[PDB]
Amino acid sequence: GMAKMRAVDAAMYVLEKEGITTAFGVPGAAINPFYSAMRKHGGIRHILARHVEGASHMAEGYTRATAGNIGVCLGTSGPAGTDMITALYSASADSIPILCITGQAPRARLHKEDFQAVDIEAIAKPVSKMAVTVREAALVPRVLQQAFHLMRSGRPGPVLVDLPFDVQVAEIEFDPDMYEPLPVYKPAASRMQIEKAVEMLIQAERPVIVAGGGVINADAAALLQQFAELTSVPVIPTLMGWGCIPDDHELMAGMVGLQTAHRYGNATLLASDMVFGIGNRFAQRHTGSVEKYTEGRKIVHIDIEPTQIGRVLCPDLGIVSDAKAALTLLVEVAQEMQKAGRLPCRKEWVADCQQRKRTLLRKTHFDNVPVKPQRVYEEMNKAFGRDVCYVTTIGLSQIAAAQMLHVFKDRHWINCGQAGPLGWTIPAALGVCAADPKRNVVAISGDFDFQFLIEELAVGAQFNIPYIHVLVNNAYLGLIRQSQMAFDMDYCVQLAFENINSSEVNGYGVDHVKVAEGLGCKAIRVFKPEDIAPAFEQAKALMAQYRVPVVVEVILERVTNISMGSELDNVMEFEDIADNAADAPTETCFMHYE
Amino acid sequence: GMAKMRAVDAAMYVLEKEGITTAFGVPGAAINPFYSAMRKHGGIRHILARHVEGASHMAEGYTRATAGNIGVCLGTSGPAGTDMITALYSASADSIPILCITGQAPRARLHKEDFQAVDIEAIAKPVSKMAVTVREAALVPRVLQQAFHLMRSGRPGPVLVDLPFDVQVAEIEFDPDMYEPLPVYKPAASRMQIEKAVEMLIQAERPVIVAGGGVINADAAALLQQFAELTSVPVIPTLMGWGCIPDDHELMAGMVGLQTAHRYGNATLLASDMVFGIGNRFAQRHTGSVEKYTEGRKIVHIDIEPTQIGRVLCPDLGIVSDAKAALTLLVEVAQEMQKAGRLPCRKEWVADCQQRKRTLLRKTHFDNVPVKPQRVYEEMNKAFGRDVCYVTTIGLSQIAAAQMLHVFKDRHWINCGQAGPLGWTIPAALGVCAADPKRNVVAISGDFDFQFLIEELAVGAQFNIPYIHVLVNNAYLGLIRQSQMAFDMDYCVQLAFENINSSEVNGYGVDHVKVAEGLGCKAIRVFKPEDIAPAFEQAKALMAQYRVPVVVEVILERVTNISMGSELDNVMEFEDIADNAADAPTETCFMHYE
Amino acid sequence: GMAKMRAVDAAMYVLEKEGITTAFGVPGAAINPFYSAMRKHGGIRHILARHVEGASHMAEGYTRATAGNIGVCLGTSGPAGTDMITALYSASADSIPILCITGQAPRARLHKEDFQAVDIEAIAKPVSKMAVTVREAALVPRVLQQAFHLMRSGRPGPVLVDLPFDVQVAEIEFDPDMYEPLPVYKPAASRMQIEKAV
């Protein structure tokens, strides 16, 4: 029971009681007492990163992988905290938590200029739900207790706790047996709100549900699918909702937006007369101009956060609610409406949506040498099972991936959709694998993304964390080249050079096979489209044999323009479209997944 | 003359008029208009980085390399700005400027949740002299004009300018012929202040001058040496003042502090009866407890910043002045005192200091296999010329390097002494080489530092920026291991693993030769101490031949405890000391440098 | 039912549903649309103060008198908000709420040195649970809805809502019949805790 211990020792009991089992971090002098308490306690597995930014993105991937997870990132004073800001921003922007813990200079030296001491509280405030330098040892467990309530409550977001060295080592009295986590705050919709929502949905003749990341955040994916099935309403996931209904479900109508979207998704949204928004916001990359997105449509919006409602457009009905509480009531009310014979039949509208999904395609089956990227994603759909979990960040790699890959369970698309920091992919994928060693993790990067934090592959080697990394290499910042076409230029976006150690990369610059191997991983390079599939097979075998990351690098043609535009009705198709399965053979309409 | 142009076009004329010729950066959609204006203008050479943090530390190295330089770092919106915070902190903490320029979302979308848009103004405020989102196109040249005044004036520090996309492209009328830079503010000491300072110096019987980074910041190194020569007063540089008097000068008395210090420097400081501080602050790693540092000593402190004076101790005489203005007057007053026969002879005190410098040494000449790090620095002193310019960051690598390497001109020790962010070394060294292609740049890293931003070597390959990187590899976070001895542990600090592609690294984990070669550079690995010198010779040859970075990796013994302690009189010597030149042959007392 | 109205008309329905019946204030040009909506709605009794600091402490006394009360303090842009800071500090310091509402310059002119315009959001942040300039008219009811949650939940404290003139007068669709106050967050001790204390 009650006993004298260091404040960091009480902190270990608190993290244990809050369900922490894993941490990613980089030790330093100012945070050694915490590491000492973590060693003495046991039962937190620590993974040492090779950049503090790598530890922070591993924590993000750990959070995102499984509902209720909270990744922990640990660092010393000074530059470790400033290296965590990009991750605090990324987690804040997507409404997910990580817990960052930094060492700090002793309290009495906070406003002197002590070595490697910085005002991390002020720097991190704009990108956290709480950022606090703890000023008393007895407050260390209470701040952690309040941190966990905030990471779980309302709109979730990250917390940074900054620990002065003397606060860490100071003795306190603490009783772990008496510690209890705080209740989680989550507002719930009333029946009056939900019956009104179902009333408007029954009155719409061509409705769609837009299912956002809040559905997954609430762990409500099964309820979302059940509600759509009862009402026979087609479902359009946002990028952050992707996976909350399987891609081969008859009601899954594609994705909508300016970039990570399908031609059939956009066409179905513009044909609809109602958008039933659950756990989405209405992001600019999803809507385009809001006047066009809402034209002729009733808009319902359910969000856990009151000030998200009305932020970018005025809904016809806005409801403050956790997505699981709201969907429980929506299923119950729809079941009552079904018993009463009041749910309209929707066979015609559903058939129109399925006809769009069958015909408005983009070509993937290219035999070109050098390889066209869209062929890579077709081969990934064939090579990996329906249980595949993809990890990606940003670039033409990621946009075409979202256009062409398919996903079948929630939290099998792991993507930092609002902030998009380059370098996220490798550490996030390691964090997913740490959360779930049985997860079939496959990452997608372009060459530039892959280079930012390439050193994290050695983390996978040192700790034997296996996954497959697909690397699509155009020796370009490809997304920025394509955006520069409006300025009639191609400037500071090329990565090619004659590699003095590798004439076999043919002027593409970095030799990613050699780099990955020096970092202790396995790697295969592919020049021809017919060699992609066997390469994925060797990679699975190499992964089982050595239990390290395996990189499959595909050498792309230098220049491919991915489909995108400024409005839902203005997306330009640069590459070939398709209206037949032979050109686009991995659409779920044509292919049985696993 | 006067003409209509985009605000970014006016920004190019302003940067030109302010002497900018180089930028380091990573383009993105939100900052494309600036890149378009930079392409159209010509005459700024852009170096594309492979991490935004790499661009920001390149800018720091460019600033530090040459007086009056200001490195420029360019990035897009969102995570690019958050990736610059560590560099803004590093530059702020050492009182040096960089100019960071980020793209931003259009003004009318700043408080919506636009894609990759973040409140970088609020995040960067604690670590900049100015951080401003520019809200009008006509203000773009005025903000840059005020930025340059602030980067040069008072205590220097960095500025971040955040540019909304619509502000960048908006047309304005601007006349480059009428643009003029603002005057620089620098307070100057009065003759009354300086005559009082010289009076106290003449009254001291055993004075030392402590010459800080402010002397170099003011470009006053030649005046500092001249003043010390006229007064015959021994000079103790801080780590940030190192190089402002040559290490082989008869008055250079060593360095003082808890870590980057000499046994003879500390012994000379504790024997002195006055510290004449010029352009230093009195940093905790330099002083230890201030009660012991000041015991029995008069303290003079000259600083350009009023609130630096008295911050950590109360000087007997504090003077607000730029170091060059103050040293001009100090030379003039000392010349008057010399003509008047009023400067005391100091042969005895100088002889005592030189006797300490001759006898209180640390051994470097180790024949051990595996190699002892101190032998590496002895070989670096022999291999490179007196014009060598070292670049380093932090770790046992850097601390022993500062204890054992020697430097002979100001701005030939390039070191982020207050913030110490891992990964700084490679990009800072590239920035020094970009500032001065004739500089003989040699970097020193440990393996962990080297891994953080290892991908930046490919920048050196793509652009042919040659320098030598000395990599001392213990497969450890060595400084953190040594600090963990107080907690009787060795925990989360090892980087070793059996590399499945390289049994020749013998369980040291990452194969840095293979990684460096895949990045397009050259690399040599050394296992035996007698092979270090030939390796430095091949590296010079490989560098001349291929004009890329050349890495020389020395395989160290896993565990070496560097000398350090908690007070000037409490530094523990773990490894062998020396009192004879055979054990420490590269001290300047024994070796003629070049 | 749902109807077109100004954002400030919707704010009156929200204040009504949240139980406000009284306000203490000093009008000015930048907060006139709010006063117009209060007058049209009726049923908030306004008491005119003879110093903005006096309205702000009237609001404190109104809160403290009766459990569940929330005093409301109204003022115009500029110095009216800076005159409310001492009350926001005093309410925060004692863990009690007041709701301060200030007028503000229109959004397009927020960083333009417009007459009597100040960054009250930044000034009031240290002494409030929330201090916010509302940047969309449709957000006015939602900001007020979150404010009442914050003033009642956890450790109570005050909120300042800052309303740009153009946000006040813009039209929105709002249904007073569908508005519902948010649930109040109040942690409870477990029986294991209370038995240990006894």
Ligand SMILES: Cc1cc2nc3c(=O)[nH]c(=O)nc-3n(C[C@H](O)[C@H](O)[C@H](O)COP(=O)(O)OP(=O)(O)OC[C@H]3O[C@@H](n4cnc5c(N)ncnc54)[C@H](O)[C@@H]3O)c2cc1C
């Ligand atoms: C290059 C690139 C291109 C992209 N292209 C597109 C595109 O074409 N189309 C597209 O849609 N996206 C696209 N995205 C992603 C886009 O930027 C957004 O991240 C995404 O649209 C937001 O999804 P969402 O609306 O579900 O919001 P989320 O960020 O997932 O959040 C939605 C809401 O969930 C709420 N919430 C949180 N927890 C709960 C809970 N328990 N219950 C209820 N609500 C809760 C939050 O308050 C928030 O308002 C792209 C991203 C990138 C990097």
Ligand SMILES: Cc1cc2nc3c(=O)[nH]c(=O)nc-3n(C[C@H](O)[C@H](O)[C@H](O)COP(=O)(O)OP(=O)(O)OC[C@H]3O[C@@H](n4cnc5c(N)ncnc54)[C@H](O)[C@@H]3O)c2cc1C
């Ligand atoms: C691992 C490690 C170990 C270290 N060990 C030591 C050690 O043992 N000893 C040691 O001394 N350092 C050590 N350092 C470096 C130390 O942390 C400080 O960076 C350094 O001591 C500060 O030097 P300084 O006093 O010259 O200050 P600076 O940071 O260089 O600044 C001094 C002053 O210059 C002023 N100034 C700026 N411009 C001008 C101008 N134009 N004119 C006049 N004044 C101006 C500023 O206002 C400031 O107050 C170590 C660093 C690391 C990373």
Ligand SMILES: Cc1ncc(C[n+]2csc(CCOP(=O)(O)OP(=O)(O)O)c2C)c(N)n1
């Ligand atoms: C830190 C950071 N800097 C800049 C950007 C802007 N950005 C988005 S995509 C991109 C290029 C990515 O190139 P690569 O990963 O090679 O992918 P490709 O588009 O070529 O497939 C850049 C620079 C960003 N997202 N993050």
Ligand SMILES: Cc1ncc(C[n+]2csc(CCOP(=O)(O)OP(=O)(O)O)c2C)c(N)n1
């Ligand atoms: C971003 C960041 N995280 C952590 C630290 C703390 N730190 C200082 S030195 C060090 C280990 C450096 O090891 P290496 O570069 O291998 O050098 P060695 O001490 O082994 O010679 C660490 C983690 C830091 N300075 N910066």
Ligand SMILES: COC1=C(OC)C(=O)C(C)=CC1=O
């Ligand atoms: C993409 O790499 C770059 C070059 O190489 C072609 C250049 O010549 C110039 C001027 C800029 C650049 O970024």
Ligand SMILES: COC1=C(OC)C(=O)C(C)=CC1=O
């Ligand atoms: C019969 O199964 C199929 C569907 O569901 C009806 C579809 O919607 C589409 C587009 C293809 C298909 O095979």
Ligand SMILES: COC1=C(OC)C(=O)C(C)=CC1=O
């Ligand atoms: C330094 O690498 C590490 C290990 O490997 C020896 C471990 O076993 C554990 C438990 C932590 C660790 O960081």
Ligand SMILES: COC1=C(OC)C(=O)C(C)=CC1=O
């Ligand atoms: C004669 O040159 C020399 C000195 O200067 C007098 C010294 O101070 C020392 C320590 C060695 C030396 O050779």
Ligand SMILES: [Mg+2]
């Ligand atoms: Mg890196």
Ligand SMILES: [Mg+2]
């Ligand atoms: Mg690319």
Ligand SMILES: [Mg+2]
């Ligand atoms: Mg090391």
